[PDB]
Write a protein that binds this ligand. Structure first.
Ligand code: A1B2V
Ligand code: ZN
Length: 140
C-alpha cells in the first residue's frame, strides 16, 4: 500500500483505490494502473520533472529503501493477475529490486522529487508507474 500526496491530490495504484477514492475521483487510467482522487488537506510530496534513471524506492516487505537503476517509461507486458488480464501496461519502468505482494504503492524518488509508485514486480523484478509526465498534478 502507499500513495503520493501532492497539493490536493492523492495518487494511488488504481487496483488499490478505495470507495472514498472512487467517490472523489479526479482521473484514472487502467493501462497505467493509476488513480488520482481529491483531498481536503494539502500534501507534502513534490513531483520530479526530470529525466533521471537512478533513484531510491521503498520496499514495505523489507522495511527498506533501495537504490535502483530503472528503465525509461515504456509499454511492458504484464502477465495475468487477480487485478488485470494479460496486457501491456504503459508508462512502466523496470528495475532489479526485490517485490512481493503487499508492495504496490511504495514511492520511487530521485534528487528532484517523486518519480512514481511501485506497480509491477517479481523474480526480482520491481516495476513502477511513472508520474513525471502528469504536469497537472502541480496545479489546480
Ligand atoms: N500493475 C499490475 O498489473 C500488477 C497488479 C498487482 C500484481 N502485479 C504484480 O506485479 C505483483 C508484484 C509484487 S508487488 C507487484 C501486477
Ligand atoms: Zn530527478
Amino acid at each position: 500500500s502507499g500513495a503520493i500526496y501532492v497539493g490536493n491530490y492523492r495518487v494511488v495504484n488504481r487496483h488499490l483505490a478505495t470507495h472514498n477514492d472512487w467517490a472523489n475521483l479526479v482521473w484514472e487510467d487502467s493501462s497505467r494502473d493509476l488513480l488520482v482522487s481529491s483531498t481536503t488537506a494539502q500534501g507534502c510530496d513534490t513531483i520530479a520533472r526530470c529525466d533521471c534513471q537512478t533513484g531510491v524506492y521503498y520496499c514495505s516487505s523489507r522495511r527498506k529503501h533501495y537504490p535502483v537503476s530503472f528503465s525509461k517509461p515504456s509499454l511492458i507486458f504484464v502477465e495475468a493477475s487477480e487485478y488485470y488480464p494479460a496486457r501491456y501496461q504503459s508508462h512502466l519502468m523496470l528495475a532489479v529490486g526485490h517485490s512481493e505482494p503487499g508492495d504496490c504503492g511504495g514511492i520511487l524518488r530521485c534528487q528532484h522529487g517523486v518519480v512514481g509508485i511501485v506497480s509491477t514486480g517479481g523474480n526480482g523484478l520491481v516495476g513502477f508507474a511513472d508520474v513525471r509526465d502528469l504536469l497537472w498534478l502541480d496545479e489546480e
